[PDB]
Amino acid sequence: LDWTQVIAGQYVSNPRFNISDYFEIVRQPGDGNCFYHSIAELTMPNKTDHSYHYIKRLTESAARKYYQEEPEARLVGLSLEDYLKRMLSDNEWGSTLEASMLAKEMGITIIIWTVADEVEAGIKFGDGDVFTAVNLLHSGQTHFDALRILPQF
Amino acid sequence: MQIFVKTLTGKTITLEVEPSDTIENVKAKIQDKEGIPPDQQRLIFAGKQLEDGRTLSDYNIQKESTLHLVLRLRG
C-alpha cells in the first residue's frame, strides 16, 4: 500500500477495493456519535453503547493540547472553548480532525477509509500501518462504523 | 497559468489561475470543476496546509505546481 505524507503525521492513499473483501464491518449507532462509538469499538474492551463517552473525554483532553495547532481546526474556526462546548454535545459529529488529535492523544494510528459501495481513498493519522491501526469506515459522506481486518490477514 | 490539483482519490485536475488568486479563489474553482464544497477542502503544498485568505504568490507557488486536495470527513 502506497501512503504519501502530505503534512507531518498525515498520510493519504488511493487503493480501490470493496470493504467486505478485507474487513469485517462492525456497524455503530446512528445517534450520531458514530465516530466516537467506532473508536470505542476498537480501542476499549467491554465496549458498549456508553463507552463513547470516554473517547469524547480523550478528545477533550487531546484538543486542549493540539486543537490550536491542528491544520484542520482552521476549517472549523471556533475558539478552543467554543469547539469544546460543540464537540462535547450529544449527537455532535466527529471527523478527521478528532482522528488527528486522538491519534496523538492515544498514541495510535487511525485510518479513515471513505467509500464513494467501494473505497475511493484513505487518510491516515500516525505512522503505523493498516495492521496495527484503528480502521474506520466513512460511508455515505456522513457516517462512521468500525472495521476489523479479516481473520486471514 | 496552470497548476495541478491531486484529489483524495488521486484524480489529477488542471486549474487556470493567477499568482494573485487567493487559496479561497482556488477552492471555488475546484468546486466549479469537480463539485466539492469548499468547506470540505484542505489544500496542501510543500507540507503546509494553505490558508484561505492568502495568495498563490504569497506561497511562492509557480506555474505547473501540484497541490494536494485532502477532504475533511465528518459523520
Side-chain angles (χ1 to χ4, degrees), chain B residues 19-23 51-59 61:
Chain B
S20 86
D21 271 336
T22 58
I23 298 298
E51 181 83 4
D52 280 1
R54 288 216 237 163
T55 58
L56 294 173
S57 80
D58 295 319
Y59 279 104
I61 287 168

Side-chain angles (χ1 to χ4, degrees), chain A residues 3-15 17-18 21-66:
Chain A
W3 290 105
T4 316
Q5 212 176 162
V6 299
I7 270 161
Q10 312 197 350
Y11 307 73
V12 167
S13 98
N14 304 327
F17 62 79
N18 333 72
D21 270 22
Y22 297 84
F23 296 95
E24 182 198 355
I25 300 178
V26 187
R27 297 291 181 193
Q28 299 306 314
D31 64 338
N33 296 315
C34 56
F35 168 84
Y36 308 108
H37 288 303
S38 308
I39 305 280
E41 187 69 51
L42 297 152
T43 59
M44 288 185 62
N46 310 324
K47 169 255 191 193
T48 73
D49 280 358
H50 304 96
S51 316
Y52 80 94
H53 284 108
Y54 191 69
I55 312 291
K56 300 198 62 169
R57 287 299 175 189
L58 284 169
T59 300
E60 152 184 46
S61 53
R64 283 190 208 282
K65 292 176 193 169
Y66 303 119

Side-chain angles (χ1 to χ4, degrees), chain A residues 108-116 119 121-127:
Chain A
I108 55 177
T109 289
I110 296 164
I111 301 174
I112 294 181
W113 299 101
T114 186
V115 298
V119 164
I123 302 166
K124 192 179 103 211
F125 305 87
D127 297 335

Side-chain angles (χ1 to χ4, degrees), chain A residues 6-7 10 12 14 34 71-72 74-76 93-97 112 114 121 123 138 141-144, chain B residues 6-10 27 38-42 44-47 49-51 68 70-75:
Chain A
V6 299
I7 270 161
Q10 312 197 350
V12 167
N14 304 327
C34 56
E72 190 168 327
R74 304 176 208 150
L75 288 66
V76 174
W93 280 18
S95 78
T96 32
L97 159 71
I112 294 181
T114 186
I123 302 166
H138 177 237
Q141 250 36 72
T142 64
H143 189 97
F144 303 103
Chain B
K6 186 170 199 170
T7 88
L8 242 199
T9 285
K27 292 183 167 162
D39 50 2
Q40 287 195 36
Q41 303 177 33
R42 312 163 57 205
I44 319 292
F45 178 78
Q49 168 180 316
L50 316 173
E51 181 83 4
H68 290 84
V70 179
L71 313 169
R72 159 140 174 78
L73 304 171
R74 306 187 70 193

